């Protein structure tokens, strides 16, 4: 996937010079979101989707939260350059124009939008049953960050504190593995620790806009990572320095999946494992960071950035990524 | 589709308050692109996909121009508020991270970005074989238009001249109708006027950025319409006034489709029928506008705006839309 994307990424970098010296020239710093130079500020742009989570939503007929997933995926990405989310468009590629499905999808869209503080300003709907085996929902968000306030991860240094914010659950990655492993054996009505499997698999992705915006306006922040595809490997997008982490106990859906034969090494590269967002702050900001974050969601001091390079050691599980 | 979409559009509108009085407020003027208020200027934002054209590209192993379709749909839409295109991000939902397909996609992405003058700044690739039977390509473009230079269509008056710019061919709407009607009957290799049916169906969408940007810098423009889904009905998005048009001869793939039983009123609502972009200018500016556009592509005086509110009269075909 990354080797196939080589040419797309390479030739897209050749187009950068098409806006050089002009408004819209891309500052080309960071990841998770593109940064376009508008002079006193950068416009941040990201694209993200719900993924095969929608196949579960269609199986049980519950569509009124996947709109929350798609807004959460995009605005959480925008936070990882330090940007404040502003606006979003959706892309809805569907097998058919089911009015009931669209009506519920719109409920999640409004809820997600209100919690994220963004206007939904437009979108496209393509009815494509030869192409789509369901209801693919994705979107593009834009945000704003003043220059000199961009948080890319360049300022991460060995010794910095690493703090995790709990996920709501599975969020929107690892659904393919979870579906293929659990549904044949248990079915979507199987009850596990008080909830049916479909409730575990459809729990809407958490939105981190309010705590992250309060954090960056209160303490010095060196890095911000939304835990999506690749799980903890996303930390490597921020920096080449290493990490020494203590991750929270494996509970809920992640425990069921592990109990069904997925080794922890793979789990931490796939699932968020209970931590949906990670921030890196200098050690003197640690106490205040934890306080601000803990007023919104359960948060953990996970560990430290290390002078050692390229390694993510999850100490309490004996794993190195 | 638009009935199912009413709920989405309605709750979308409710989210505008979240940016009221703030940077990024939805300007809520225009039609083909969202306008976000950034003070001196609006950011215009649009979303568009290629559609089922990608199924033809796959069969003949030629994705080399699908990226041009994606870019063209988005930047042509941006032009319709008078915006200059700046940057684009892609959303690529695929069945497989096929290195060959991706290498091909990237060639056309570069070519189209260069012809459109846009930077390709990012994108997500979602590999979901359970959800996608091919390689679905969409994207979101942003552009910039100064306050006071938005072209909404509000300035369209009866008597204004209506000018069409030739399409390159079928572009990116009506492909499902065309695919189902012609491929089983004729076969993909069917030779029609010296080209195979797949070549007619795959011909990349035309990009109108250079002629339209030249037009708006030289003549007073009252309306700009990219001919996409809905064909000539897109003109009704600009004004309540009517149109009287003489459309060009039905040729190429549109003739083959017509000779296979599709009624002419439906064709003018589905296919671009040879006209990919329409401009509306004061009658006294008609000759100058034609000269500017005809530098770049074959262009047509189509007719005039009328006082027959809401009607589009294709006089030379006896069709009223």
Curated annotation (Swiss-Prot), chains A, B:
It is an enzyme of class 6 (ligase). Keywords: ATP-binding, Cytoplasm, Ligase, Nucleotide-binding, Purine biosynthesis. It catalyses: 2-formamido-N(1)-(5-O-phospho-beta-D-ribosyl)acetamidine + ATP = 5-amino-1-(5-phospho-beta-D-ribosyl)imidazole + ADP + phosphate + H(+). InterPro entries: PurM-like_C_dom (IPR010918), PurM-like_C_sf (IPR036676), PurM-like_N (IPR016188), PurM-like_N_sf (IPR036921), PurM_cligase (IPR004733). GO terms for cellular component: cytosol. CDD domains: PurM. Its main location: cytoplasm. GO terms for biological process: 'de novo' IMP biosynthetic process; adenine biosynthetic process. It comes from the Archaea. PANTHER family: TRIFUNCTIONAL PURINE BIOSYNTHETIC PROTEIN ADENOSINE-3, TRIFUNCTIONAL PURINE BIOSYNTHETIC PROTEIN ADENOSINE-3-RELATED. Belongs to the AIR synthase family. This is Phosphoribosylformylglycinamidine cyclo-ligase.
